[PDB]
Amino acid sequence: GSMPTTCGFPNCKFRSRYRGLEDNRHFYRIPKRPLILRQRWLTAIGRTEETVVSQLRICSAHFEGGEKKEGDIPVPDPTVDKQIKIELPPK
Numbered sequence: 001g002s003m004p005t006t007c008g009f010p011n012c013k014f015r016s017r018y019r020g021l022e023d024n025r026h027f028y029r030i031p032k033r034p035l036i037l038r039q040r041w042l043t044a045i046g047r048t049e050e051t052v053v054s055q056l057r058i059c060s061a062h063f064e065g066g067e068k069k070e071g072d073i074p075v076p077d078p079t080v081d082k083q084i085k086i087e088l089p090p091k
């Protein structure tokens, strides 16, 4: 990305956890597949669908493992909170 990316968390304690170097972490866009995963992604940020996706992005630091696939929802703190993940129906 060319623009200084700000994630859409109500309180990103991760880019603030760093001091001058946010690791330039992979800024994830909210998945659209599956749809229920996209829906779940809004839960982490406490946002709605008309209030998300456009500008809102998510730091890879909001994941236990830093990996977004198709069943991984962001969390406020993987080291404290409950990493929200889902079991996507196989095919």
Ligand SMILES: [Zn+2]
Residues within 6 Å of the ligand: 007, 008, 009, 012, 013, 014, 015, 058, 059, 062
């Ligand atoms: Zn963040």
